[PDB]
Design an enzyme around this catalytic site. Structure first.
Site, PDB file in Angstrom:
ATOM      1  N   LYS A   1       0.575  -1.916   0.027  1.00 51.95           N
ATOM      2  CA  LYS A   1       0.361  -0.204  -0.343  1.00 51.95           C
ATOM      3  C   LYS A   1       1.127   1.761   0.364  1.00 51.95           C
ATOM      4  O   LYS A   1       0.670   1.878  -0.990  1.00 51.95           O
ATOM      5  CB  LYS A   1      -0.436   0.168   1.260  1.00 51.95           C
ATOM      6  CG  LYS A   1      -1.859  -1.228   1.526  1.00 51.95           C
ATOM      7  CD  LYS A   1      -2.396  -1.275   2.651  1.00 51.95           C
ATOM      8  CE  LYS A   1      -1.488  -1.511   4.170  1.00 51.95           C
ATOM      9  NZ  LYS A   1      -2.612  -1.624   5.249  1.00 51.95           N
TER      10      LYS A   1
ATOM     11  N   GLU B   1       0.200   6.377  11.262  1.00 58.53           N
ATOM     12  CA  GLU B   1       1.226   5.640  10.552  1.00 58.53           C
ATOM     13  C   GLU B   1       2.544   6.018  10.849  1.00 58.53           C
ATOM     14  O   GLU B   1       2.799   6.538  11.840  1.00 58.53           O
ATOM     15  CB  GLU B   1       0.995   5.559   8.732  1.00 58.53           C
ATOM     16  CG  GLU B   1       0.035   5.005   8.290  1.00 58.53           C
ATOM     17  CD  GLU B   1       0.143   2.847   8.148  1.00 58.53           C
ATOM     18  OE1 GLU B   1      -0.545   2.243   8.333  1.00 58.53           O
ATOM     19  OE2 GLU B   1       0.935   2.781   8.925  1.00 58.53           O
ATOM     20  N   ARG B   2       3.729   5.062   9.906  1.00 56.98           N
ATOM     21  CA  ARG B   2       5.123   4.873  11.506  1.00 56.98           C
ATOM     22  C   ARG B   2       5.596   6.697  11.307  1.00 56.98           C
ATOM     23  O   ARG B   2       5.680   7.601   9.999  1.00 56.98           O
ATOM     24  CB  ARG B   2       6.094   4.116  10.550  1.00 56.98           C
ATOM     25  CG  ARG B   2       5.643   2.821  10.444  1.00 56.98           C
ATOM     26  CD  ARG B   2       6.414   1.830   9.671  1.00 56.98           C
ATOM     27  NE  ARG B   2       5.897   0.850   9.471  1.00 56.98           N
ATOM     28  CZ  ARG B   2       4.012  -0.378   8.995  1.00 56.98           C
ATOM     29  NH1 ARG B   2       3.981   0.901   8.824  1.00 56.98           N
ATOM     30  NH2 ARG B   2       5.239  -1.555   9.394  1.00 56.98           N
TER      31      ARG B   2
END
Ligand SMILES: Nc1ncnc2c1ncn2[C@@H]1O[C@H](COP(=O)(O)OP(=O)(O)O)[C@@H](O)[C@H]1O
Ligand SMILES: Nc1ncnc2c1ncn2[C@@H]1O[C@H](COP(=O)(O)OP(=O)(O)O)[C@@H](O)[C@H]1O
Ligand SMILES: [Mg+2]
Ligand SMILES: [Mg+2]
Lengths: 165, 481, 524, 31
Positions: B161, B187-188
């Protein structure tokens, strides 16, 4: 004289009041609105009522003041026959199909007229002549004037090249 | 009205915090600054989600709720959480609130908009059915992304993704006269650095000169209140470029599941009874108000790519299943396809696109694309027969379908330009005309004599025939030795 | 519309998104159950809401509908003391409308909360309802007043088959008496906003808006509207039913309605059961679908036909909401995902699909051909699993004929099926069936200068449609004339048109053959 | 086929028990 519905309740056979409503017609979509109002007041259409409606389809112009797209007195007429034959279980008499033959010759749709004189001749064993020659006149009218079918579709030799649109 | 109206903290259970106001509670979604001092390094800002009574209101914390005593002084802002907009935002990084987190001085702003805007009405909607050529074979051929489209990348953990979003930023967002916004939703934090650097190297973000990107990050380290609301903060900035400036804009939400998951945390603590699979009962409504704002209006046009995490590789789960209805091009990534060797890992049968239609795309595009889907459907049926009976047991015509269909699966793979480190090969932007023609010829059977591994991990037909030439030459040398 | 206030029943206490609870005003008036209430968001503006809980305390549970952002705690609440009535009639047609009745810009009222017709009020379903699909109208025939479910996965053609059924009515409705016109009501529950716009344009281009009204509760709009959207849809149809006219109702979809009702129930602390849904989630869909019916001759003989759509997740019929709706409706039309991708569109799984009142619903002409097709496809499916028989040849051609994008006209469908039944497409190959069918309907080979000589029966004359419906094809009037048309069409197609396939083995002619045949799949 | 169908049927029932115990164990925490 007496009649009963599917459950077995009494039903209003007094048709004559609702017939005179259909005679004051003006536009043929109003005839359907009357046919609704009889059924609503537990009074199913009589064999004479359908013929009285068929008369109004022939005489008047179409639905109401404004025109609808792709008007067809024949299609509205033949739907009403399907209702009386199959659902209501009533065989249309000689008067019923004579109104249909009139509309074919009046509007000029002779090709339908060929199919419906075959219908009128068979089963109900009657050939009304008057309209047969008037229908055959419109058949010869199409031949001698120019052509009978669409014309532009018929002559054009396809074979591999046919437009999909 | 209600501008600096004072209240006190009634109760603190996690990120969810109740506040008592003496002169009545503010409205819903109203931002509140905690004025009281404490031993904090960073400030605390609460957004009211519910009302309990006329004088008390339940909230959610955007920062951590550490060191928060009871009866602590709290003051209203004036309205909703406000975020800066316009061309002064371009180039800069932001958080959920709209404070600059990149240490490059104060932002030029000059206007601020509220995070919780209302979605456009029916009259505002408009359809502009044009193909957005992504330069990727599986997408452009089978599930083509349209201009103005809301696009979703569904897949489980570690399928491609984040790789596909990065490739789309290379392939589409660089050569684009519009601006772009990136919602880093839960997210990261480390992935956010690599995007910021790679954009600075390629000069889509520029320090000294013109920038064409905005970054709004609310990452895993942040509490649920931020990670929930950070998707809307980015969407407000894109809404300014859409409505006010009247422009075609891109939006990038990685990941939209983390919005739903963030709301699932607060919803438990707010005292709502959970629905199916332990999600919030307002799951469809939360996505509703967010996703409906993401649309092509009469004024401008958002074209949103989104990533969607499929938890436990369960596509029937509410979080993706509810999202599928909102999207125009649904991209589905499968783990078994990834582990078999095909990257990107796009399972084309579960995918779909609205513009896959003879009216929008060309007749040659639709007919070729359908034949790939038809052939792959026959191939899956034949794959079950070969496992039972054998390869030799199949018919004469069916063997040739397998040879082509095996090549179709291999030719659908593509080495990405962002993924040079992973693949160990240079990228390939495959043109729409190249994609349609090469696949068309393969269905005809013009490349039957071409070997199968020539089609694996290449771009268009020129690269296939180039690899087939290299395979013929190296096979000739090893045979001679 | 602007609702009618009466008495100030209480103040707003708590809000939780799209739900609220009230405290009663001094005196404790107590609002009636299931009624609308207007919350004063400002001095000039109001915000509607439905009453769902009447607690012992005096508190009243509210489902918010309008101006949800503008609702606040401490605001005044006026009551109507009436159930929700909405604008209904012929004047509402060709427009988009909310569950509350407000028109979306782009007539006596009727109760949304109404009891269904009783035992003696209804009658057996006899009038047919043409979807315009050879797969459906033969094997899974829908009658007027029937409830026919549409189930299947995302992107399997659930909306398209429902929308094209509405579009199929325009060709009939234009020609027929307006008494028997099928007025449609497309309800859009929880859908995306642009999807409603594309359906509006698609309905407008095919002249459907004249005979259609669009109920709309999009994903942006709250759960209260989504919950109530199918109920408002039926109310508008019941007007036509109770006034002796036939109507159609599409709910797209009941899956998203249930999710909206679950949100409402859970937020108001109603005890949840299976898959977190409340106890009465079966009752939700049951009282909706039972209001769709076929009335007796004693009450006009009108109808409301129901086409509820229900999304399944990976072909799982065992889900609670899917299993509930199957047990209510009169069979289903199952749309398989593998058939969709395989080629067959619409992807109607005939084995899984079923109509509980099929035979009586069909037309006399359609009943003649379709009775045989069940015998042929039964033997074809069995023999395909386990050398070509007559059933194997003719069975495969039916499968090719069932593929279609837009809906077929009743005449053009039944003749192409009658040809395959008596075996006119046996010598014709499977790939050239759509080219054979296209040349039958639009063109004609007999008239294409030569061996014509039919007195009445041709395919260009669309008016024969209604004569066929009366007399059927198997009848002394049309049998001999029809079998000429087909004999001329087959012999000329095999000789002149199919001869090319032995020939064409070259580049730029094989591709030209493909592009011709692919376009023939769309137009029936 | 017999033994896998039984496991499908056990998983169907065990799933709905476990679903509802969690859902109603939630509202015991909420009173
Ligand atoms: N197009 C691609 N080319 C090469 N490797 C890929 C590709 N797509 C995914 N991968 C592999 O998937 C792994 C993680 O993918 P990523 O997109 O970061 O995870 P997620 O799918 O959870 O966002 C990488 O280590 C990489 O090897
Ligand atoms: N009979 C058909 N023939 C060809 N394509 C179809 C047919 N029915 C639907 N489609 C296509 O399938 C796609 C999804 O259709 P839709 O009705 O939205 O399915 P769903 O309601 O299940 O999502 C659309 O892009 C449409 O063009
Ligand atoms: Mg990722
Ligand atoms: Mg749909």
């Amino acid at each position: 004289a007496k009649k009963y519905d599917l459950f077995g309740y009494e039903v209003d056979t007094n048709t004559a009041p609702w017939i005179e409503k259909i005679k004051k017609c003006k536009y043929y979509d109003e005839a359907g609105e009357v046919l609704v109002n009889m059924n609503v007041s537990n009074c199913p259409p009589d064999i004479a009522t359908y013929n009285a409606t068929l008369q109004c389809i022939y005489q008047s112009p179409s639905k109401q003041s404004t025109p609808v797209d792709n008007e067809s007195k024949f299609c509205a007429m033949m739907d009403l026959l399907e209702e009386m034959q199959h659902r209501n279980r009533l065989k249309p008499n000689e008067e019923s199909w004579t109104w249909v033959m009139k509309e074919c010759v009046k509007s000029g749709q002779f090709r339908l007229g060929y199919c419906i004189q075959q219908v009128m001749e068979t089963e109900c064993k009657g050939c009304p002549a008057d309209l047969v020659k008037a229908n055959e006149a419109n058949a010869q009218k199409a031949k001698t004037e120019g052509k009978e079918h669409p014309g532009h579709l018929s002559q054009q030799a396809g074979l591999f090249d046919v437009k999909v649109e | 009205d209600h501008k600096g109206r004072v209240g006190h903290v009634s109760q603190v259970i996690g990120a969810v915090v109740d506040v008592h106001f003496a002169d009545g509670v503010p409205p819903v979604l109203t931002a509140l600054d905690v004025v009281d001092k404490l031993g904090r390094d960073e400030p605390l800002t609460l957004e009211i989600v519910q009302h309990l009574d006329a004088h008390t209101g339940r909230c959610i914390a955007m920062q951590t709720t550490d060191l928060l005593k009871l009866k602590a002084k709290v003051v209203s802002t004036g309205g909703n959480i406000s975020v800066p907009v316009g061309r002064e935002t371009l180039g800069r990084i932001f958080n959920v609130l709209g404070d600059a987190i990149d240490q490059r001085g104060p932002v030029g702003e000059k206007l601020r908009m509220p995070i919780h805007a209302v979605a456009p009405k029916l009259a505002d909607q408009a359809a502009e059915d044009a193909v957005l050529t992504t330069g990727i074979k599986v997408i452009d051929l089978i599930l083509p992304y349209c201009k103005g489209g809301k696009i979703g990348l569904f897949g489980g953990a570690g399928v491609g993704k984040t790789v596909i979003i990065m490739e789309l930023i290379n392939n589409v967002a660089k050569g684009h006269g519009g601006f772009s916004v990136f919602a880093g939703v839960g997210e990261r934090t480390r992935e956010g650095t690599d995007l910021y650097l790679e954009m600075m190297q390629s000069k889509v973000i520029d320090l000294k000169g013109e920038s064409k990107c905005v970054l709004v990050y609310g990452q895993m380290n942040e509490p649920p209140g931020a990670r929930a609301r950070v998707a809307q903060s980015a969407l407000t900035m894109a809404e300014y470029f859409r409505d006010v400036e009247g422009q075609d804009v891109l939006l990038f939400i990685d990941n939209i599941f983390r919005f739903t998951q963030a709301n699932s945390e607060v919803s438990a603590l707010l005292g709502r009874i959970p629905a199916a699979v332990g999600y919030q009962p307002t799951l469809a409504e939360d996505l509703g108000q967010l996703q409906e704002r993401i649309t092509s209006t009469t004024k401008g046009s958002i074209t949103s790519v989104q990533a969607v995490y499929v938890p436990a590789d369960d596509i029937t789960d509410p979080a993706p299943a509810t999202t599928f209805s909102h999207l125009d091009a649904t991209t589905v990534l499968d783990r078994a396809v990834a582990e078999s060797g095909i990257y990107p890992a796009v399972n084309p049968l579960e995918c779909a696109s609205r513009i896959m239609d003879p009216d929008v795309i060309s007749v040659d595009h639709y007919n070729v694309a359908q034949d790939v889907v038809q052939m792959l459907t026959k191939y899956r049926e034949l794959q079950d027969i070969i496992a039972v009976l054998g390869i030799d047991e199949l018919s004469e015509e069916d063997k040739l379908i397998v040879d082509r269909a095996r090549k179709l699966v291999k030719f659908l793979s593509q080495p990405f330009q962002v993924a040079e480190v992973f693949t160990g090969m240079t990228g390939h932007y495959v043109q729409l005309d190249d994609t349609i023609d090469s696949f068309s010829g393969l269905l005809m059977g013009t490349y039957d004599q071409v070997p199968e591994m020539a089609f694996y991990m290449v771009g268009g037909i020129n690269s296939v025939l180039e690899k087939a030439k290299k395979m013929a030459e190296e096979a000739a040398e090893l045979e001679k030795m | 519309s602007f609702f009618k206030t009466t008495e100030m029943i209480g103040y707003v206490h708590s809000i939780d998104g799209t739900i609220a609870t009230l405290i009663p005003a001094p005196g404790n008036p107590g609002v009636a159950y299931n009624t609308i209430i207007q919350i004063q968001v400002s001095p000039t503006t109001f915000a509607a809401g439905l009453v769902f809980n009447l607690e012992k305390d005096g508190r009243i549970g509210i489902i918010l509908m309008d101006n949800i952002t503008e609702v606040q705690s401490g605001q005044k609440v006026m009551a109507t003391g009436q159930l929700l009535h909405i604008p209904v009639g012929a004047g509402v047609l060709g427009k988009v409308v909310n569950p509350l009745g407000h028109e979306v810009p782009v007539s006596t009222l009727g109760k949304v909360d109404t009891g269904a017709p009783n035992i003696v009020s209804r009658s057996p379903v006899n009038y047919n309802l043409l979807t315009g699909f050879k797969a459906v109208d033969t094997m899974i025939p829908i009658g007027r007043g029937q409830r026919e479910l549409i189930v299947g996965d995302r992107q399997t053609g659930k909306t398209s088959i429902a929308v094209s059924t509405i579009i199929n009515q325009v060709r009939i409705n234009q020609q027929i008496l307006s008494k028997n016109a099928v007025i449609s009501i497309y309800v859009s529950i929880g859908q995306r906003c642009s999807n409603v716009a594309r359906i509006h344009r698609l309905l407008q281009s095919y002249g459907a808006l004249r005979y259609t009204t669009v109920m709309a509760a999009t994903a942006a709009e709250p759960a209260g509207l989504q919950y109530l959207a199918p109920y408002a849809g039926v109310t508008m149809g019941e007007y036509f039913m109770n006034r002796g006219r036939h109507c159609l109702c599409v709910y797209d979809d009941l899956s998203k309605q249930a999710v909206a009702y679950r949100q409402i129930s859970l937020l108001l602390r109603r005890p949840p059961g299976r898959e977190a849904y409340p106890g009465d989630v079966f009752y939700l869909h049951s009282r909706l679908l039972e209001r769709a019916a076929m009335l007796s001759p004693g009450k006009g003989g009108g109808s409301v036909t129901a086409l509820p759509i229900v999304e399944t997740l990976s072909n799982d019929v065992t889900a609670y909401i899917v299993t509930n709706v199957i047990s209510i409706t009169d069979g289903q039309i199952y749309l398989d995902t593998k058939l969709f991708t395989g080629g067959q569109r619409p992807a109607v799984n005939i084995g899984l699909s079923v109509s509980r009142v099929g035979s009586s619903a069909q037309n006399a002409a359609m009943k003649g051909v379709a009775g045989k097709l069940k015998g042929i496809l039964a033997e074809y499916r069995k023999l395909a699993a386990d050398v070509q028989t007559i059933p194997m040849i003719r069975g495969a051609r039916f499968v090719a004929l069932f593929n279609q994008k837009q809906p077929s006209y009743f005449m053009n469908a039944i003749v192409s099926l009658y040809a395959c039944l008596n075996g006119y497409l046996d010598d014709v190959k499977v790939q050239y069936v759509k080219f054979y069918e296209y040349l039958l309907v639009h063109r004609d080979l007999g008239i294409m200068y030569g061996t014509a000589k039919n007195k009445f029966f041709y395919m260009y004359v669309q008016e024969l449609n209604y004569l066929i419906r009366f007399f059927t094809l198997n009848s002394p009037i049309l049998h001999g004339e029809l079998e000429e048309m087909l004999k001329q069409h087959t012999h000329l197609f095999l000789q002149h048109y199919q001869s090319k396939m032995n020939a064409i083995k070259s580049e730029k002619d094989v591709k030209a053959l493909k592009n011709l045949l692919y376009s023939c799949k769309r137009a029936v | 086929q017999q033994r896998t169908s039984s496991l499908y049927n056990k998983t169907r029932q065990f799933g709905i028990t476990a679903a509802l115990i969690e859902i109603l164990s939630a509202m015991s925490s909420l009173e």
